[PDB]
């Protein structure tokens, strides 16, 4: 019973500072890598950072480098996300997930491997990798959704994972390290890659599949990419 319980919602004015906590359970806290993301009111989702839970090591883009502070408490697991000076534009939903294994033989920090969500913390202050932005199809057909990168991220690493979101849900897992599938997952979904550019297979379309799918992927000196999203429509 994996479960990540986050911090409640909370609404700050321009200028101020803000703690998200997110306290995991059903697991070694100090054995998996822990992920900050969040999503903007009708945008797409944004990676804020990774961290390290046994060592501390935390690294963050280029853009939060130094509004965001993430740090962990071992002796009670759990994680705590600070941001500084807010604006309108930090008006987001923000999660934390579980991300690769702390291993001793390899990095699975960047590994866009986000099995396990929170619930989300809503906060009110008051492009990337190219996906095309709707795809249609109708019951029973097949369709498939691009997703265009360049070299040094999607043209050379295995490492890309889909997701799918319904209106007002959690993201969820569907494809990791461009073509496996997690448990639970419908055989429907397969994945490929050619070149610079991803792809998601769904084969037998139904309506369980309308959504909005977006694609993850390594993206150089330790950091991850999210796309711009595609939204399925069936006919």
């Known amino acids: 019973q994996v479960q990540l319980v986050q911090s409640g919602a909370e609404m700050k004015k321009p200028g101020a500072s803000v703690r998200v906590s997110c306290k995991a359970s059903?697991?070694?806290?100090?054995?998996?890598?822990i992920h900050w993301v969040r999503q903007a009111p009708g945008q797409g989702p944004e990676w804020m950072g990774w961290i390290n839970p046994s060592t501390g090591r935390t690294n963050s883009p280029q853009k939060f480098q130094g509004r965001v502070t993430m740090t962990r408490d071992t002796s009670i697991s759990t994680a705590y996300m600070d941001l500084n000076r807010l604006t309108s534009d930090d008006t987001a939903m923000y999660y934390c997930?579980?991300?690769?294994?702390?291993?001793?033989?390899?990095?699975?920090?960047?590994?866009?491997?986000?099995?396990?969500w929170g619930q989300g913390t809503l906060v009110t202050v008051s492009s990337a990798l190219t996906q095309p932005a709707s795809v249609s199809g109708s019951p029973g057909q097949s369709i498939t959704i691009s997703c265009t990168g360049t070299?040094?991220?999607?043209?050379?690493?295995?490492?890309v994972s889909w997701y799918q979101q319904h209106p007002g849900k959690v993201p969820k897992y569907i494809i990791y390290?461009?073509?496996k599938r997690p448990s639970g997952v419908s055989n429907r979904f397969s994945g490929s890659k050619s070149g610079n550019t991803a792809s998601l297979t769904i084969s037998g379309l139904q309506a369980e599949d309308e959504a909005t799918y977006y694609c993850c992927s390594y993206a150089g000196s330790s950091i991850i990419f999210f796309g711009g999203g595609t939204k399925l429509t069936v006919h």
């Open positions: 059903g697991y070694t806290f100090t054995d998996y890598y």
């Open positions: 997930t579980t991300g690769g294994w702390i291993g001793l033989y390899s990095d699975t920090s960047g590994y866009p491997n986000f099995d396990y």
């Open positions: 070299n040094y991220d999607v043209g050379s690493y295995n490492l």
């Open positions: 390290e461009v073509n």
